[PDB]
């Protein structure tokens, strides 16, 4: 047996896959410097932002007039979005619905409405049907989450509810995130309908008429869609992570506002100007960052690394080796 | 220079960097993106 981490001769044997090494110079591996500490930097915003009244609301809007709300400059918490109901559907595209407590987003959009029971599958990327092309359309590069839950005990009534409407007739399919509130009559025929009902003149709205008696696949469902935008920005909104003091001139691993890395942070001389947040290099990688608690610029440089070679005669003659470190001045090994 | 510039390709994945892929998706799903990136980079280096 041979231990591949005892001495350079053993490493050479382990690389060559042999118990005898002949005369020559062999390239064994590379040497790096490991991190010692760990820091996390997040913005100092501590207030919360509206999530209770988005879900604990009295009346949601119809499908064709879906309610839109913008969420920014807060601290998001998603633990409270667990006990909505005994059973509910929670599907996220582009993110996993367990890791969105340590991610920083630019702007959050919340769209709320109420849908027929069996049409929940139609709120999805690139799906066709009745509401996905005439009421609510989603893009093909969506990055967000969809939540749906039962609303029989609250919405359906015995006396009769007719306050929820959808649209059935339209010229062309809707652009994503586009709303229509027109009531102009349909023109299937060749003659004008002069704003009166008749054949080929249909009013492009319809009612649900929910009653507590229909089958399990027909009761109303409440649907809310969350849209994110994970890009480069001041990062107005993100969740509950505790900050830590920053260190300099030492190889550590860092998490700057959602950007994870390892390296050495140094005071910067770049000529940033107000709107510039971070910088790049020739190879399209991050080089400079701006600390979101002091508004100062730091430069990132990976800590020392290099290549190691072993010079030995044949194992038949001796077991002595010499080590060559490539491209380094060994006053700074 | 072109070998260096190939590092910004996506190869059908959701991002051109690895840390955000590992910090946004669960282990069951990040494997496809990691495989795509690894295969693309291996092909580029082999061609070189």
């Amino acid at each position: 047996a041979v231990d591949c981490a005892l001495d350079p001769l053993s490493e050479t044997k382990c690389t060559l896959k042999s118990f005898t090494v002949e005369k020559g110079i062999y390239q064994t591996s590379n040497f790096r410097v490991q991190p010692t500490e760990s820091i996390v930097r997040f913005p100092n915003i501590t207030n919360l932002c509206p999530f209770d009244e988005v879900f604990n609301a009295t009346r949601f809007a119809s499908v064709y007039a879906w309610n839109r709300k913008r969420i920014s400059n807060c601290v998001a918490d998603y633990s409270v979005l667990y006990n909505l109901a005994p059973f509910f559907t929670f599907k996220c595209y582009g993110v996993s619905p367990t890791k969105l407590n340590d991610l920083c987003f630019t702007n959050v959009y919340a769209d709320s409405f109420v849908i027929r029971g069996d049409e929940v599958r139609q709120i999805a990327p690139g799906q066709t049907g009745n509401i996905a092309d005439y009421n609510y359309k989603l893009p093909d590069d969506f990055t967000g989450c969809v939540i749906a839950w039962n609303s029989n005990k609250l919405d359906s009534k015995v006396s009769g509810n007719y306050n929820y409407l959808y649209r059935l007739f339209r010229k062309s399919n809707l652009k994503p995130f586009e709303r229509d509130i027109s009531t102009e009559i349909y023109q299937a025929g060749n003659k004008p309908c002069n704003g009166v009902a008749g054949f080929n003149c249909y009013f492009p709205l319809r009612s649900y008429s929910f009653r507590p008696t229909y089958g399990v696949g027909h009761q109303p469902y409440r649907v809310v869609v969350l849209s994110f935008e994970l890009l480069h920005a001041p990062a107005t909104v993100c969740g509950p992570k505790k900050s830590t003091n920053l260190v300099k001139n030492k190889c550590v691993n860092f998490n700057f506002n959602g950007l994870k890395g390892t390296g050495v942070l140094t005071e910067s001389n770049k000529k940033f100007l107000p709107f510039q947040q971070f910088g790049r290099d020739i190879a399209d990688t991050t080089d400079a960052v701006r600390d979101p608690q002091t508004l100062e610029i730091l430069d990132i440089t990976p800590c020392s690394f290099g290549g190691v070679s072993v010079i030995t005669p044949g194992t038949n003659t001796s077991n002595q080796v010499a080590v060559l470190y490539q491209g380094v001045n060994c006053t700074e090994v | 220079n072109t070998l260096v510039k190939q590092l910004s390709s996506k190869f059908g994945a959701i991002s051109s960097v690895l840390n955000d892929i590992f910090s946004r998706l669960d282990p069951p799903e990040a494997e496809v993106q990691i495989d795509r990136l690894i295969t693309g980079r291996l092909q580029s280096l082999q061609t070189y």
Binding site: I282, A283, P302, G307, Q326 | N1, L3
Partner: peptide, 28 residues
């Protein structure tokens, strides 16, 4: 020599960026 000097003069940050990706150049 004179001609060798002329020939040597005739033929002539990116290096650091390449090195930080793992590509190095060995000496003769």
């Amino acid at each position: 020599s004179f001609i060798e000097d002329l020939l040597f003069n005739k033929v002539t940050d990116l290096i650091c960026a390449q090195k930080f990706k793992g590509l190095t150049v060995l000496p003769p």
